[PDB]
Amino acid sequence: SKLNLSTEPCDVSDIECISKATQVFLDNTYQGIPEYNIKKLDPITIPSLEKSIEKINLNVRYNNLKVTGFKNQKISHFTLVRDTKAVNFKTKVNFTAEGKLVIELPKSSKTYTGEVTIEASAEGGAAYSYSVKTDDKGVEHYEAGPETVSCEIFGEPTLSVSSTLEDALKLDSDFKKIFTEYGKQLTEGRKQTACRIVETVYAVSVHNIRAAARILPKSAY
Ligand SMILES: *[C@@H]1O[C@H](CO)[C@@H](O)[C@H](O)[C@H]1NC(C)=O
Known part of the structure; x- marks a missing residue:
């Protein structure tokens, strides 16, 4: 014992432990594990994001947006209320979304399509x-x-x-x-x-935690 740095399952009031287990999970699942219904998070492709501001007469549609950076996301807050087993956590993230932009100008019957990159x-x-x-x-x-x-x-x-x-x-x-x-x-x-x-x-990432919680018993608690 005396020097045990062995990790072991978290006590329910052991918040920095459960926070840290949430982080270890994210960091080791962003590639996806499809065998256990865990989806890829980095890179993740969003197929479509259409949008129309009326009547400023413009439609903008982002297609096949490849989003990268979520592998690097870092927990910044983590609450777990033991009464409800209510969880609230935030992560900080910098991502890049790269794909096609379609701009339509319907009153002119025109369309333009080119590459787009968004960073936040x-x-x-x-x-x-x-x-x-x-x-x-x-x-x-x-x-x-x-x-x-x-x-x-x-x-x-x-x-x-x-x-x-x-x-x-x-x-x-x-x-x-x-x-x-x-x-x-x-x-x-x-x-x-x-x-x-x-x-x-x-x-998606909560889908993944949800999917992991289904498999596990989980005296990984
Ligand atoms: C996140 O992006 C910003 C630049 O906008 C900057 O804080 C930094 O390069 C990024 N964070 C980390 C930990 O790299």
Whole structure:
């Protein structure tokens, strides 16, 4: 004993332990473990994110967004309320989302498609509670319930486009009319989109904790 640095399962009031077990898990599962219903988190591809601001007459659609950086996410807060087994934790993350942008200008019947890269620094949070459930036939497991995700962005995301796509947009009068009169709100849109990426990926990562809690007994508590 005297010098035991052996890790062992956490006591329910042992918060920095459970926080740390949450971190070890994230760090060793971001590649995915499909054998146990654990999804990849870095890289993670978001297939589609369509969006339409009316009647500023513009549709913007991000396609096949490859998101990287979540492997590096670091827990910044971790609450566990023993009465409800209610969990709340936040991580800090810097990600890059890389894919295709489609800009449609419906009143002109035009479309442009080029490469896009978004980068943000954020802090996202997840809140949910555990129930212990049957759960099949004598095996009892923790069951994480539906979560709420928060999103805070630090600074302003950088949005970056191919230079051919910049040129095409600069040279389009319908788009320029919008950028000139509504530049503000487009810039808004960019922060909404960062929070959408964050929401999407944090739901996956809680899916993963949820999937792990189903397999385990878990006197890994
Ligand atoms: C997160 O991104 C920001 C730059 O916007 C900076 O704090 C740092 O390079 C990143 N964090 C870490 C731990 O690298």
